[PDB]
Write a protein that holds these residues in place. Structure first.
Motif, PDB file in Angstrom:
ATOM      1  N   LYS A 359     -12.255   7.873 -11.595  1.00 25.44           N
ATOM      2  CA  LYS A 359     -11.614   7.490 -10.339  1.00 25.44           C
ATOM      3  C   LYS A 359     -12.197   8.279  -9.171  1.00 25.44           C
ATOM      4  N   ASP A 360     -12.487   9.565  -9.387  1.00 24.01           N
ATOM      5  CA  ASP A 360     -13.207  10.338  -8.379  1.00 24.01           C
ATOM      6  C   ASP A 360     -14.633   9.828  -8.218  1.00 24.01           C
ATOM      7  N   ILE A 361     -15.230   9.333  -9.306  1.00 23.48           N
ATOM      8  CA  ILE A 361     -16.544   8.700  -9.205  1.00 23.48           C
ATOM      9  C   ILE A 361     -16.461   7.415  -8.386  1.00 23.48           C
ATOM     10  N   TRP A 362     -15.352   6.684  -8.506  1.00 21.92           N
ATOM     11  CA  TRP A 362     -15.154   5.484  -7.695  1.00 21.92           C
ATOM     12  C   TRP A 362     -14.926   5.839  -6.230  1.00 21.92           C
ATOM     13  N   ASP A 363     -14.263   6.968  -5.972  1.00 19.30           N
ATOM     14  CA  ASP A 363     -14.156   7.468  -4.602  1.00 19.30           C
ATOM     15  C   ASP A 363     -15.530   7.830  -4.043  1.00 19.30           C
ATOM     16  N   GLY A 364     -16.373   8.450  -4.870  1.00 24.07           N
ATOM     17  CA  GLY A 364     -17.756   8.674  -4.482  1.00 24.07           C
ATOM     18  C   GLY A 364     -18.527   7.384  -4.273  1.00 24.07           C
ATOM     19  N   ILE A 365     -18.186   6.339  -5.027  1.00 22.15           N
ATOM     20  CA  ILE A 365     -18.797   5.028  -4.825  1.00 22.15           C
ATOM     21  C   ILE A 365     -18.354   4.428  -3.495  1.00 22.15           C
ATOM     22  N   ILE A 366     -17.104   4.673  -3.101  1.00 21.08           N
ATOM     23  CA  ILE A 366     -16.640   4.250  -1.780  1.00 21.08           C
ATOM     24  C   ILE A 366     -17.388   5.006  -0.687  1.00 21.08           C
ATOM     25  N   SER A 397      -4.389   2.402 -11.647  1.00 21.16           N
ATOM     26  CA  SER A 397      -4.884   1.270 -10.880  1.00 21.16           C
ATOM     27  C   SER A 397      -5.158   1.678  -9.436  1.00 21.16           C
ATOM     28  CB  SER A 397      -3.881   0.118 -10.917  1.00 21.16           C
ATOM     29  N   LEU A 398      -6.043   0.925  -8.786  1.00 24.23           N
ATOM     30  CA  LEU A 398      -6.346   1.174  -7.384  1.00 24.23           C
ATOM     31  C   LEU A 398      -5.151   0.813  -6.510  1.00 24.23           C
ATOM     32  N   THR A 399      -4.882   1.657  -5.519  1.00 23.30           N
ATOM     33  CA  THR A 399      -3.740   1.444  -4.642  1.00 23.30           C
ATOM     34  C   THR A 399      -4.021   0.321  -3.651  1.00 23.30           C
ATOM     35  N   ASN A 400      -2.950  -0.159  -3.010  1.00 28.14           N
ATOM     36  CA  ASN A 400      -3.098  -1.174  -1.972  1.00 28.14           C
ATOM     37  C   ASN A 400      -3.854  -0.624  -0.770  1.00 28.14           C
ATOM     38  N   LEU A 401      -3.612   0.644  -0.424  1.00 26.11           N
ATOM     39  CA  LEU A 401      -4.367   1.280   0.651  1.00 26.11           C
ATOM     40  C   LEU A 401      -5.835   1.437   0.274  1.00 26.11           C
ATOM     41  N   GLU A 402      -6.112   1.738  -0.998  1.00 26.86           N
ATOM     42  CA  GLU A 402      -7.494   1.820  -1.461  1.00 26.86           C
ATOM     43  C   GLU A 402      -8.178   0.458  -1.408  1.00 26.86           C
ATOM     44  N   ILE A 403      -7.449  -0.605  -1.759  1.00 20.85           N
ATOM     45  CA  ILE A 403      -8.006  -1.954  -1.683  1.00 20.85           C
ATOM     46  C   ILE A 403      -8.258  -2.349  -0.233  1.00 20.85           C
ATOM     47  N   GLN A 404      -7.360  -1.948   0.672  1.00 19.56           N
ATOM     48  CA  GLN A 404      -7.562  -2.207   2.093  1.00 19.56           C
ATOM     49  C   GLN A 404      -8.769  -1.446   2.631  1.00 19.56           C
ATOM     50  N   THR A 405      -8.966  -0.207   2.174  1.00 22.22           N
ATOM     51  CA  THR A 405     -10.136   0.563   2.589  1.00 22.22           C
ATOM     52  C   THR A 405     -11.424  -0.044   2.041  1.00 22.22           C
ATOM     53  N   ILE A 406     -11.378  -0.575   0.817  1.00 22.00           N
ATOM     54  CA  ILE A 406     -12.544  -1.251   0.250  1.00 22.00           C
ATOM     55  C   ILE A 406     -12.852  -2.527   1.025  1.00 22.00           C
ATOM     56  N   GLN A 441       0.358 -10.112  -4.458  1.00 20.78           N
ATOM     57  CA  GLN A 441       1.275  -8.985  -4.324  1.00 20.78           C
ATOM     58  C   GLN A 441       2.112  -9.090  -3.053  1.00 20.78           C
ATOM     59  N   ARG A 442       1.808 -10.077  -2.197  1.00 15.87           N
ATOM     60  CA  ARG A 442       2.420 -10.238  -0.871  1.00 15.87           C
ATOM     61  C   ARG A 442       2.284  -8.963  -0.037  1.00 15.87           C
ATOM     62  N   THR A 443       1.118  -8.332  -0.124  1.00 17.82           N
ATOM     63  CA  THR A 443       0.918  -7.049   0.531  1.00 17.82           C
ATOM     64  C   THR A 443       0.688  -7.248   2.027  1.00 17.82           C
ATOM     65  N   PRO A 444       1.443  -6.561   2.880  1.00 16.85           N
ATOM     66  CA  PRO A 444       1.194  -6.654   4.321  1.00 16.85           C
ATOM     67  C   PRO A 444       0.005  -5.799   4.731  1.00 16.85           C
ATOM     68  N   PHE A 445      -0.396  -5.964   5.991  1.00 19.20           N
ATOM     69  CA  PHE A 445      -1.470  -5.149   6.544  1.00 19.20           C
ATOM     70  C   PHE A 445      -1.024  -3.696   6.652  1.00 19.20           C
ATOM     71  N   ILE A 446      -1.894  -2.787   6.221  1.00 17.27           N
ATOM     72  CA  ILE A 446      -1.575  -1.368   6.116  1.00 17.27           C
ATOM     73  C   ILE A 446      -2.364  -0.608   7.172  1.00 17.27           C
ATOM     74  N   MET A 447      -1.660   0.194   7.964  1.00 19.69           N
ATOM     75  CA  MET A 447      -2.267   1.060   8.965  1.00 19.69           C
ATOM     76  C   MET A 447      -2.019   2.511   8.576  1.00 19.69           C
ATOM     77  N   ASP A 448      -3.068   3.328   8.642  1.00 15.78           N
ATOM     78  CA  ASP A 448      -2.957   4.724   8.241  1.00 15.78           C
ATOM     79  C   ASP A 448      -2.104   5.508   9.230  1.00 15.78           C
ATOM     80  N   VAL A 449      -1.355   6.481   8.707  1.00  9.83           N
ATOM     81  CA  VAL A 449      -0.535   7.333   9.564  1.00  9.83           C
ATOM     82  C   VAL A 449      -1.412   8.272  10.382  1.00  9.83           C
ATOM     83  N   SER A 450      -2.484   8.788   9.773  1.00  9.24           N
ATOM     84  CA  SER A 450      -3.365   9.719  10.473  1.00  9.24           C
ATOM     85  C   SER A 450      -4.153   9.021  11.574  1.00  9.24           C
ATOM     86  CB  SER A 450      -4.312  10.391   9.479  1.00  9.24           C
ATOM     87  N   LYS A 451      -4.659   7.822  11.300  1.00  9.77           N
ATOM     88  CA  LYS A 451      -5.440   7.053  12.262  1.00  9.77           C
ATOM     89  C   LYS A 451      -4.619   5.856  12.716  1.00  9.77           C
TER      90      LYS A 451
END
Lengths: 552, 68, 98, 170
Positions: A359-366, A397-406, A441-451
Motif C-alpha cells: 500500500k505504501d508502494i501504491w502511494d509511491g506509485i501515486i 481497500s483504497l479509500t474514497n479520498l484516495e480514489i478521488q486523488t487518483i 457507492q453514491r460517493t459525493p465530491f470530496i474536498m480536502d480540509v487542508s486544501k
C-alpha cells in the motif's frame, strides 16, 4: 545431344534410373571430359554430379577419381573462378568429397582452397567456395592451414556486411569448433575472442557474435558452459547496459534469460550474489538501475522468490525509490521507470500487493503518477489499473479520498499536453471505473480540509466532478493539436460515464458534457476545419447520441 | 523499455571490480584479457599498402645480409 | 610483363600468381642475380616497382620524372641496380634507400 | 514522419532507417530541419565494393539534389555516425547524351572534390586504361574513398575507370 538426352532421361524418370544401367555410361563421361567443347564438359559435369549423388560401385568410384583429377586439371587451366567451367568444376569437387570416400591429394585440396579463399568475401562468389569449405569440414580432412581458414571465417563473421555470408561463416566456424580438436589455450582464446567482439563498433557484427554465442549456449555442455557463462553473463549485462542499439540490448536480455535456466546452481548463485552486489551499491543511480534490471530479468527467468534475500533487497530498493519518487528526486527518470516495471513484475508474480507495505508502494506509485515523466506516468497508470482489481482483494481497500486523488492525477495527466495514446486510453478506462465505483457507492465530491478552494463545490457527486473535469479538459484549448487525442479519449470516457451513471446524474452532467461537445458542434461548414477537430466533432456526436439514449 | 532507456555508462572492468569476491574474478578468466577485439576493416588499398610496407621491411632485412 | 605482371611456372599452363601494383601496364622486368627472389619492373607511368617472391608481393614503388626503359642488377652487389631513362641519363640505385 | 521524409511512395527497410536518421538530424538541428523539410530522397540502393563492403547510393531529384549539395558536409557527417562503416553518397536519377550523363554521375560521386583531369592510355594490343585525376584539397579521406568511388561508378555506368590523386604517389 547424347549428353542432353541422358540428362533429360535421369532428370525425368527416377524409378527407371538404376545403378546398373549407368555404369556403362560413366566411361563415356570420363572420355567426354577431355573434350575441348565447353558445353560438352559442362553437361558432362552436370551428369557426373548427379551420378556422384547417386550410389555406385568400386570401379565407378575409381572412374570418379579419374574424373576428379581431370576436373582438377580443368580448375588449374581455368584462369578465373567466375568462369562457368571453373564454377562447375568446384561443384563437382565439392560433391565428390561430400559423397565419395575417396579423397584427392592434400596438396590439390590446398590448391583449390587457395583459389577459393578470396571468394569468401564477395557475395557473388561466396556460395560455391563455402560449399567446398563445408564439404571439407564435414569430411574432416586435416590440412595445415585450415586453422587459418577458420580464423578467416571468424573475421568474415564479425566484419562482413552481408547477412547470408555471416550466417554461412557462422555455420562453418561452429562446425570447426565443435568437431575439430584444438588446444585448450586455443579454445579459451576463441571464447575470449567472442567475449571481446561483443564490444564491437559494428552493431551487425555484435549481433552476429550474439547469434554465435546463442548457438554456443544452446548446444554447449553445462559443465563447459558455466566457466564460460560467468564471463558471458558479465559481458551480456555490459551490452544490455551500454550498447547503443536497443535491438542489441533486447537481444542481450533475451540471451541472458535463455542462459539462466541452463546455468548450474553455482553459476546462478554467483549471478545472484552479483545482483545483490549491484543492488547494494546504491551510491551510483545507474549502477543500482542496472542491478534492478538484472534482478527483474533473473526473476522472470528463474521464477519468483528463488532468492528471498535478493528479492527483499530489490523490494527495499524499490521502496527507497518510492520514498524518493516525487518531483525533484535525485533518482533518474529512467531508473524510476525501471523500478516501476520491476514493481509491476513483482506484483504480477506475487500476492504481496495485498500487504500494507505494498500500500505504501501504491502511494509511491501515486507519487510516480504525479511525477512529470510520461513513461513513469504510464507505468503508474498501469499499476493503478492493476490495483483497481487488486484493491478489493487487498487487505486494506483504497479509500474514497484516495480514489478521488487518483482521479485528480488522471485528470492532470489528461490536461497535460503530450500524452501517449495507450496512456490516454488507460486514463479513460480508469476514469470510467472510478465513475462506476462512485455511482455504486453514491460517493459525493470530496474536498480536502487542508486544501480548501474557498467556494462551493461545482458538482455534488464524485462521478459528476470527474465528468465536469473531463469536460473542462476537453473544452480547454491551450494546445489544441497536442491535446486532441486527450480530448477524444475524454469524449469516449464521458460517453462511458454517461452510460455508467444514473439517469438523474446523467441529466445533471449532460450540460457539462455537451458544453465541450458544443464547441465542435457550433462550427458548421467551416472553411478550414482540422482533421483532429473533425474527429473530436464525430466523437462529440457519438457522445451526444449516447446522452440522448440515456436521457430523453 | 529498458533497451530504450539510456545508459551513466559503467565499465565491465568496473563491474568486475565492484564484484566483492575475488574468486568470482578468478572464475571469470575469459573476461580478463588483452582486449583482442577486431578493428573495423580498412579499405583494401590501404591494407595492401600496409602489407607492402611490411614486405619492404622484410626484404630490406633479408638483403642487408650481403652488406658485409 | 604487359598489362599485368604474372609469375608463371613451366609446369603449369596458366600464371601462378598476379603481382601487379594497381591498374597500370608494365614494360620491362629483371630478376636479381644474387637474391634471386627479388624482381624489379618498369611501368609506363614513370614508375619502378620492386617485388619479393618470398612475400609474393610488390615491395615498393618509386615515381620519377620520365619513363624508365630497362633495369639491370649488379652481379656483385645484390642491392644495386641501374635504370636506363628517357632523361637521356641512367641512374644507379640502392634498393634499401630509393 | 519517415514516409513524409522519403519521396518514394513505398518505403524500404533501409529507406525507413535513413529517413529516421534524417528525422533525428532534423530534431537535433532546427536549421537542418528547415533545410530537410523541403528536401526528400526519391530512392536508395546499396552497391557492393570489393573487400566485402557495401556503400549507400541515395538517388534524389535535381533541385533537391542541389539542396543536398549545399548541405552535404553536415549530412554526411551525421550519416557516417548513424550508419556504421558505410560510405553514403548522393546522386540524381539521370535517365538515358550518355557521355554527359556519365560525366554528371562522375561529378556527383566525386563531390565535393574537384576533377583535375581525365586521361585514357591506349596500349599495344588494344587495351585501354581510363583514369580520373581528383583534387587534393582533403587527401586523407579521399584515399579511403577511391575504391568505393570506382566500384559505384562501375556498377552504375558499366565503365571501369581508375580513380587517383596526382599530387600523392600511390
Amino acid at each position: 545431344f547424347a549428353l542432353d538426352l541422358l540428362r533429360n532421361v535421369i532428370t525425368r524418370h527416377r524409378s527407371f534410373l538404376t545403378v546398373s544401367h549407368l555404369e556403362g555410361f560413366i566411361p563415356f563421361l570420363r572420355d567426354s571430359l577431355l573434350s575441348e567443347n565447353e558445353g560438352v564438359v559442362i553437361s558432362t559435369l552436370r551428369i557426373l554430379i548427379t551420378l556422384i549423388r547417386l550410389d555406385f560401385s568400386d570401379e565407378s568410384s575409381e572412374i570418379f577419381k579419374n574424373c576428379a583429377r581431370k576436373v582438377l586439371n580443368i580448375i588449374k587451366v581455368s584462369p578465373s573462378t567466375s568462369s562457368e567451367l571453373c564454377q562447375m568444376g568446384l561443384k563437382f569437387l565439392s560433391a565428390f568429397i561430400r559423397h565419395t570416400d575417396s579423397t584427392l591429394k592434400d596438396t590439390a585440396l590446398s590448391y583449390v582452397l587457395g583459389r577459393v579463399l578470396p571468394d569468401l568475401n564477395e557475395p557473388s562468389r561466396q556460395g560455391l567456395a563455402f560449399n567446398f569449405l563445408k564439404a571439407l569440414v564435414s569430411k574432416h580432412i586435416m590440412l595445415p592451414e585450415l586453422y587459418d581458414i577458420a580464423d578467416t571465417t571468424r573475421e568474415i563473421m564479425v566484419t562482413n556486411h552481408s547477412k547470408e555470408i555471416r550466417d554461412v561463416s557462422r555455420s562453418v566456424y561452429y562446425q570447426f569448433l565443435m568437431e575439430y580438436d584444438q588446444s585448450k589455450g586455443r579454445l579459451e582464446k576463441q571464447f575470449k575472442f567472442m567475449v571481446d567482439n561483443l564490444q564491437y563498433p559494428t552493431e551487425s557484427g555484435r549481433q552476429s557474435v550474439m547469434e554465435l554465442i546463442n548457438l554456443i549456449i544452446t548446444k554447449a555442455n553445462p559443465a563447459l558452459l558455466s566457466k564460460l557463462s560467468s564471463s558471458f553473463f558479465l559481458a551480456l549485462v555490459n551490452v544490455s547496459f551500454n550498447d547503443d542499439a536497443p535491438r542489441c540490448r533486447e537481444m542481450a536480455s533475451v540471451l541472458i534469460s535463455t542462459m539462466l535456466p541452463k546455468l548450474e546452481n553455482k553459476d546462478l548463485e554467483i549471478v545472484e550474489k552479483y545482483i545483490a552486489a549491484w543492488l547494494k551499491q546504491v551510491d551510483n543511480a545507474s549502477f543500482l538501475n542496472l542491478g534492478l534490471r538484472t534482478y527483474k530479468v533473473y526473476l522472470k527467468s528463474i521464477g519468483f522468490e528463488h532468492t528471498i534475500e535478493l528479492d527483499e533487497l530489490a523490494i527495499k530498493r524499490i521502496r527507497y525509490i518510492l520514498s524518493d519518487t516525487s518531483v525533484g528526486s535525485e533518482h533518474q527518470w529512467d531508473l524510476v521507470y525501471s523500478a516501476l516495471n520491476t514493481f509491476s513484475s513483482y506484483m504480477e508474480a506475487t500476492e504481496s500487493v495485498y500487504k500494507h507495505g505494498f500500500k505504501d508502494i501504491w502511494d509511491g506509485i501515486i507519487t510516480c503518477l504525479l511525477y512529470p515523466h510520461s513513461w513513469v506516468r504510464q507505468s503508474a497508470a498501469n499499476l493503478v489499473h492493476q490495483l483497481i482489481a487488486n484493491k478489493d482483494k487487498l487487505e486494506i481497500s483504497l479509500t474514497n479520498l484516495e480514489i478521488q486523488t487518483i482521479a485528480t492525477r488522471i485528470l492532470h495527466q489528461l490536461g497535460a499536453p503530450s500524452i501517449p495514446e495507450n496512456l490516454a486510453n488507460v486514463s479513460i478506462k480508469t476514469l470510467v471505473n472510478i465513475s462506476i465505483l462512485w455511482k455504486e457507492q453514491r460517493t459525493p465530491f470530496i474536498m480536502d480540509v487542508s486544501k480548501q478552494t474557498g467556494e462551493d463545490l461545482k458538482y455534488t457527486t464524485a462521478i459528476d466532478y470527474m465528468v465536469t473535469r473531463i469536460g473542462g479538459i476537453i473544452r480547454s484549448d491551450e494546445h489544441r493539436m497536442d491535446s486532441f487525442m486527450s480530448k477524444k479519449a475524454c469524449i469516449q470516457l464521458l460517453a462511458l460515464l454517461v452510460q455508467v451513471l444514473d439517469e438523474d446524474e446523467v441529466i445533471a452532467e449532460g450540460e457539462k458534457i455537451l458544453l465541450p461537445l458544443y464547441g465542435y458542434l457550433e462550427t458548421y461548414y467551416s472553411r478550414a476545419v482540422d482533421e483532429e477537430q473533425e474527429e473530436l466533432r464525430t466523437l462529440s456526436n457519438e457522445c451526444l447520441k449516447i446522452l440522448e439514449d440515456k436521457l430523453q | 523499455n529498458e533497451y530504450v532507456l539510456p545508459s551513466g555508462k559503467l565499465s565491465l572492468t568496473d563491474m568486475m571490480n565492484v564484484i566483492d569476491d575475488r574468486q568470482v574474478i578468478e572464475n571469470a578468466n575469459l573476461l580478463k584479457g588483452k582486449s583482442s577485439t577486431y578493428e573495423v576493416p580498412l579499405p583494401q588499398r590501404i591494407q595492401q599498402r600496409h602489407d607492402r610496407k611490411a614486405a619492404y621491411e622484410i626484404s630490406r632485412q633479408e638483403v642487408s645480409k650481403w652488406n658485409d | 610483363g604487359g598489362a599485368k605482371i604474372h609469375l608463371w611456372d613451366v609446369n603449369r599452363l596458366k600464371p601462378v600468381s598476379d603481382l601487379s601494383w594497381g591498374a597500370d601496364n608494365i614494360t620491362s622486368l629483371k630478376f636479381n642475380q644474387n637474391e634471386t627472389d627479388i624482381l624489379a619492373s618498369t611501368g609506363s607511368d614513370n614508375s619502378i616497382v620492386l617485388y619479393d617472391l618470398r612475400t609474393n608481393s610488390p615491395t615498393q614503388k618509386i615515381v620519377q620524372t620520365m619513363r624508365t626503359n630497362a633495369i639491370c642488377w649488379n652481379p656483385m652487389e645484390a642491392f644495386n641496380f641501374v635504370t636506363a631513362n628517357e632523361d637521356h641519363n641512367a641512374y644507379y640505385y640502392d634498393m634499401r634507400n630509393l | 514522419a519517415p514516409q513524409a521524409k522519403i519521396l518514394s511512395q513505398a518505403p524500404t527497410e533501409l529507406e525507413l532507417q535513413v529517413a529516421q536518421a534524417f528525422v533525428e538530424l532534423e530534431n537535433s538541428s532546427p536549421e537542418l530541419k528547415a533545410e530537410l523539410r523541403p528536401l526528400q530522397f526519391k530512392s536508395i540502393r546499396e552497391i557492393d565494393v570489393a573487400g566485402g563492403k557495401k556503400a549507400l547510393a541515395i538517388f534524389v531529384p535535381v533541385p533537391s539534389l542541389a539542396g543536398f549539395h549545399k548541405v552535404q558536409t553536415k549530412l554526411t557527417r551525421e550519416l557516417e555516425k548513424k550508419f556504421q562503416d558505410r560510405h553514403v553518397i548522393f546522386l540524381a536519377e539521370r535517365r538515358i547524351t550518355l557521355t554527359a550523363v556519365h560525366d554528371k554521375i562522375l561529378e556527383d560521386l566525386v563531390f565535393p572534390t574537384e576533377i583535375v583531369g581525365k586521361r585514357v592510355r591506349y596500349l599495344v594490343g588494344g587495351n585501354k586504361i581510363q583514369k580520373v585525376l581528383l583534387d587534393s584539397k582533403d587527401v586523407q579521406q579521399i584515399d579511403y574513398k577511391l575504391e568505393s568511388f570506382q566500384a559505384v561508378y562501375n556498377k552504375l555506368t558499366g565503365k571501369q575507370i581508375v580513380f587517383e590523386i596526382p599530387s600523392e604517389t600511390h
